[PDB]
Design a protein around this ligand. Structure first.
Ligand code: PHT
Ligand code: PHT
Lengths: 288, 288
């Protein structure tokens, strides 16, 4: 692990130190999310992607051990993406491969769209955020449901969420439960929830909708400027496969160098649920 | 190459001879098909899958350089599958990975269903045959049209068909053209087409419908007993991606260990159209 200052924000990141083309991992979730998500959430892939390249994972704005956004105006999708981009510029990353999950996928997409010179490959995993908004309800309804039904307890909450989305499940690693718990009791987490509740309607959600609209625009125009791989779990409970397929149709419309991989007996956490196939497929995509 | 006798049928096959897990390639087409399909149709894949295992390719019944079925009763999908099974048994293939394309895909399924002891992994590529029958028309309508509009000439026919199906391909290799021309003009081809016209309605087509109904039954029952990969080209013209997806949905119902890979800018011959991606993905899948 390491810590650095990115445009006035204290950012924690992970670096493989290998001398290969870099792979940047952008995790899911957003600031103030009822579940803490961090570098450790990548779990085994941090080691597993060692063969395919120099692995880097970064804590997003206002998540993990990274600082909250400097201003309320920065509670936007674009601020997050720009934070990751500035982080990459700071580390002199080139020939980059972006692997994003959930909300991170959205981040990754934007970067690919906004900075093709830096990015060579893009991987989107189970990202309802990058995809068009659901026809009814919100992308948060599943999560609101899971939060409201959660039993008291910090670890109990995390296990509750894992039970909510795991399909090919086993108990979470104890270390991760400990770290995620530590994140959960943290004052920054409280501040994150407060910031979300404060800035969701004014800043975050509009940036989300406008972001989806922009991504859809680019997909209908020239598509993504880099080779794209979409990974999804057939049994994903938060985000249905249908929107994953639809997102693939939108990408495939004008992005010739693109592919879709659907894994059965997997949920939102495909890399966790079906680790070996995920590594085999995504790894195959990265090493070509 | 080599020739061996499989239940009284002269059978041509290719074996790289490596001491690795076997990969059996079953090519497309059926006996009497207006285009000859053989081991050579696999082209680069024959060398390319050398990395992933011991490659074997076999000419199907009444196809390539193998003899026509001995009896009119043997013009069935099950007879073809039985020929391939018998062939694999004679050479002592175990831990087999079945990779079937188009009609071969159907064969690949049957064996997987019928001989789990022999088969360890399954790959289906662009198989309208394995998929359910079309809601309107037949799986041959596309081909009947391609046949009827073809200009005179053997090479002219083969390039006509290639133009009909190619998406990211360039003019065919001359090496393949000579072989395909010789196959087309050969007396055996004439005998195969005549035999097809003779046995299509009574034996072959009922065997096809019954095969589809049976496969669907097994898929809805216990599914396939081996890890399965379904590969498809998004721009497939003979067999639309929708029916491919439908087939994957049918498989995924009870086959936990299954995946679907959709490749953009590829058609029926995915392995030709997107060679590097295809080799990467399928090769990664075969090696786990
Ligand atoms: O985990 C996520 O990335 C996420 C959070 C909230 C809504 C949707 C999503 C998603 O993209 O799966
Ligand atoms: O690929 C084939 O061999 C084929 C030929 C004729 C109709 C359908 C198919 C198929 O399964 O795609």
């Amino acid at each position: 692990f390491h810590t650095v200052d990115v445009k006035g924000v204290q950012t924690r990141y992970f670096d493989d130190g290998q001398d290969k083309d870099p792979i940047l991992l952008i995790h899911g979730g957003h600031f103030g999310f009822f579940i803490p998500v961090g570098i450790e959430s990548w779990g085994n892939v941090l080691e597993d992607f060692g063969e395919y390249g120099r692995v880097l994972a970064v804590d997003k704005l206002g998540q993990g051990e990274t600082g909250l956004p400097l201003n309320d105006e920065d509670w936007t999708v674009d601020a997050v993406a720009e934070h990751v981009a500035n982080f990459a510029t700071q580390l002199g990353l080139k020939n980059l491969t972006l692997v994003g999950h959930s909300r991170g996928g959205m981040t990754a997409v934007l970067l690919a769209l906004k900075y093709p010179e830096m990015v060579k490959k893009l991987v989107i995993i189970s990202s309802a955020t990058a995809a068009p908004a659901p026809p009814v309800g919100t992308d948060m309804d599943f999560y609101e449901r899971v939060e409201r039904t959660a039993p008291g307890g910090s670890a109990e909450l995390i296990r509750h969420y894992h039970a909510a989305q795991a399909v090919n499940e086993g108990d979470l690693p104890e270390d991760y439960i400990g770290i995620a718990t530590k994140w959960l009791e943290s004052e920054k987490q409280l501040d994150a929830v407060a910031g979300y509740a404060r800035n969701a309607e004014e800043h975050w959600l509009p940036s989300l909708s406008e972001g989806r609209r922009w991504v859809q625009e680019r997909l209908a125009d020239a598509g993504i400027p880099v080779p794209t791989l979409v990974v999804w779990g057939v049994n994903n409970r938060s985000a249905p496969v249908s929107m994953g397929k639809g997102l693939f149709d939108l990408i495939a419309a004008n992005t010739l160098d693109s592919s879709l991989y659907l894994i059965n007996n997997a949920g939102h956490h495909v890399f966790s649920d079906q680790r070996e196939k995920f590594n085999a497929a995504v790894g195959a995509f990265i090493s070509l």
